[PDB]
Amino acid sequence: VEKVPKYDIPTKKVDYVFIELDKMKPHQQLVQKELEAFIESVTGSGIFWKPMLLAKVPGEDMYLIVDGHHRWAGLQKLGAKRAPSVILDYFSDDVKVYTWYPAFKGDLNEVVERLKKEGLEVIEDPEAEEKAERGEIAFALVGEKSFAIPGGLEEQKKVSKVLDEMSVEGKIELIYYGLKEDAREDMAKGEIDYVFIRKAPTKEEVMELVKRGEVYSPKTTRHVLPFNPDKIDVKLEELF
Numbered sequence: 137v138e139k140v141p142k143y144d145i146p147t148k149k150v151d152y153v154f155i156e157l158d159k160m161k162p163h164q165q166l167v168q169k170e171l172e173a174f175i176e177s178v179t180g181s182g183i184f185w186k187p188m189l190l191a192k193v194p195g196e197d198m199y200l201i202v203d204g205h206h207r208w209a210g211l212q213k214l215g216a217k218r219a220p221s222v223i224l225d226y227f228s229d230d231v232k233v234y235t236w237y238p239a240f241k242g243d244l245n246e247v248v249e250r251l252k253k254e255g256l257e258v259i260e261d262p263e264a265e266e267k268a269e270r271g272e273i274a275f276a277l278v279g280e281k282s283f284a285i286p287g288g289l290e291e292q293k294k295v296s297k298v299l300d301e302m303s304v305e306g307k308i309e310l311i312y313y314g315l316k317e318d319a320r321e322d323m324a325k326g327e328i329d330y331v332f333i334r335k336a337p338t339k340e341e342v343m344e345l346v347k348r349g350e351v352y353s354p355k356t357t358r359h360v361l362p363f364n365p366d367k368i369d370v371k372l373e374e375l376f
């Protein structure tokens with residue numbers, strides 16, 4: 137579940153170009169339910185109406201997937217070869233990269249234990265949020281108390297993996313907030329107990345990870361773009 141600000145992003149009529157799926161590089165792990173929903177939808181209508189948003193990888197014959205991970209993965213699993221795509225000026229100041237703020241209503245002790253079980257530390261620390269925003273720890277975990285979760289990407293992946301696991305199990309309610317202060321607003325309402333805060337990746341870091349053949353956890357990047365492409369008229373049969 138997502139709570140984003142009411143982003144007035146304009147729709148613009150940008151044309152698409154077919155790009156081969158094997159030239160597209162993901163920067164996040166897939167979410168299997170999102171993959172499956174895309175597959176049901178596209179095969180249901182046989183129309184692919186939402187172009188991929190791509191960025192050329194400097195120095196390679198390859199494109200970063202900016203938006204479209206499950207479209208990409210779902211088309212590949214169906215046997216398709218290409219997708220209609222819009223190529224972005226990614227390094228333009230008009231494109232911004234934020235993150236998501238996983239927030240939870242639930243009990244901190246089950247969550248702290250099942251983080252500790254996957255190898256993480258969870259250390260009470262009043263500077264945790266400050267450290268996380270400078271990118272010095274994996275996450276700050278902030279509610280009634282404040283906890284530092286040390287590490288880097290490996291530990292961020294475990295946190296995401298645990299928060300999704302105990303969703304799958306059913307012990308927690310979980311909103312990904314676009315803004316941490318909207319999670320802190322709702323925190324004060326009683327609807328949210330804890331929020332996980334990490335530093336957002338930069339563009340250069342996103343490219344760097346992709347060039348290393350690595351990926352972030354789901355819900356790591358939150359791109360704010362200068363436009364949403366207008367919808368397109370492409371038949372699924374055209375993609376094979």
Ligand SMILES: Nc1ncnc2c1ncn2[C@@H]1O[C@H](COP(=O)(O)O)[C@@H](O)[C@H]1O
Nearest residue numbers: 174177178183184185186204205206207
């Ligand atoms: N028939 C379709 N053609 C293209 N995109 C679709 C279709 N049905 C659903 N979607 C989108 O597929 C996306 C799957 O997630 P992602 O590709 O990660 O953005 C969602 O944003 C859906 O809106």
